[PDB]
């Protein structure tokens, strides 16, 4: 699987970076969240903590999926803003 960042925004109020990216996987299934997160952080120099992946979305016939991610500075602001369900889904907190 390969990754290609399409757009980045900075939200100075909530204190986050909002990343829109594409994921090319030709002949393979939809990649997991662990691999996408590892690659994202390894590339963009982000803390593995303070980074949550929203939807990974596949399409009818594409072999190209889309992705949205949020990168926070502090972890307290993160836990204050984001809801608990995406945190449990990503694995940064327990149910």
């Amino acid at each position: 699987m390969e990754i290609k960042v399409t757009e980045i925004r900075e939200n100075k109020l909530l204190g986050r970076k909002e990343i829109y990216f594409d994921v090319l996987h030709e002949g393979e299934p939809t990649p997991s969240r662990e691999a996408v997160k590892g690659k994202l952080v390894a590339m963009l120099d982000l803390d593995p903590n303070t980074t949550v992946i929203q939807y990974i979305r596949s399409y009818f016939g594409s072999n190209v999926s889309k992705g949205y991610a949020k990168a926070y500075e502090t972890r307290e602001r993160m836990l204050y803003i984001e809801p608990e369900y995406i945190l449990v889904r990503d694995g940064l907190v327990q149910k």
Binding site: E26, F60, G61, N63
Partner: protein
């Protein structure tokens, strides 16, 4: 009052047992490998709508009228039924065979990717045909003028290998 329901996008014949119409539609269905009568009537209704818009816009005064005129002609050019130097009066000469020629099944046949319309339908439904960058599984997609030169076999597909048995048998004819 009453709210709006969704209405059919096709019309039926006024009488169901006329010999001329029966023969014509039988020939067309056989030659183009159409599942049922409902498809034919869909394309005929498309054509009838085009013709009605032409008749209404013909010799009518208004900026909106000329706007609609240009929009109609450009939409037809883009669909691939008329050329760039065409006039409103050229719409009243179109037939349903044109719409039947502009669909993905017929085009996959003409382009030599299949030997028969039935084989083309099967390929399209099983997912061995890709438009410029997208797999499509509807044999009546009505390919546009800017996509007819980007139709081929899907990347992951047995037919994408030069040395496939059925691909060899298909190429036999060409």
């Amino acid at each position: 009052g009453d709210p709006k329901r969704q209405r059919k996008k096709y019309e039926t014949p006024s009488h169901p047992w006329i010999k001329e119409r029966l023969d014509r539609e039988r020939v067309l269905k056989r030659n183009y490998a159409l599942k049922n009568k409902k498809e034919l009537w869909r394309h005929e209704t498309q054509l009838k709508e085009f013709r009605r818009r032409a008749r209404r816009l013909l010799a009518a005064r208004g900026k909106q009228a000329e706007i609609e005129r240009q929009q109609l002609l450009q939409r037809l050019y883009r669909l691939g039924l008329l050329p760039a130097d065409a006039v409103l009066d050229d719409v009243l000469s179109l037939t349903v065979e044109d719409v039947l020629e502009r669909r993905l099944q017929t085009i996959v046949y003409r382009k030599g990717l299949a030997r028969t319309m039935k084989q083309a339908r099967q390929l399209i439904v099983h997912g061995h045909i890709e438009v410029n960058g997208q797999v499509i599984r509807s044999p009546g997609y009505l390919v546009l003028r800017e996509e007819e030169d980007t139709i081929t076999y899907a990347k992951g597909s047995p037919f994408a290998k030069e040395g496939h048995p059925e691909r060899m048998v298909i190429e036999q004819a060409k």
